[PDB]
Amino acid sequence: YNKDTNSYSAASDDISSANLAAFLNPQARDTTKATVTIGGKDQDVNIDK
Amino acid sequence: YNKDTNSYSAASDDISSANLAAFLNPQARDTTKATVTIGGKDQDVNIDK
Numbered sequence: 852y853n854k855d856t857n858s859y860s861a862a863s864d865d866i867s868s869a870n871l872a873a874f875l876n877p878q879a880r881d882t883t884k885a886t887v888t889i890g891g892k893d894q895d896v897n898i899d900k
Numbered sequence: 901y902n903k904d905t906n907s908y909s910a911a912s913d914d915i916s917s918a919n920l921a922a923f924l925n926p927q928a929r930d931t932t933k934a935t936v937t938i939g940g941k942d943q944d945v946n947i948d949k
Binding site: 877878 | 927
């Protein structure tokens with residue numbers, strides 16, 4: 852969890868494939884913004900559940 | 901939903917035989933204070949999932 856300066860960080864391997872939905876949306880209908888790139892080419896996306 | 905003064909109320913018949921856990925605990929470990937009585941015996945209980 853590499854507690855460095857503030858709220859705890861973390862580092863993990865492939866464990867959350869389908870777990871992004873609940874983690875990124877703590878409530879029943881939260882929505883999260885993210886930036887997705889395929890390499891040198893950024894795109895801005897919105898992710899919900 | 902009988903909107904009276906504030907955040908909407910409601911009133912429903914026997915529908916939530918097992919649905920109490922999700923409703924009172926939206927998160928993964930929420931706990932709710934509660935009161936239970938059999939009639940003349942007020943008892944204080946905690947409900948979690």
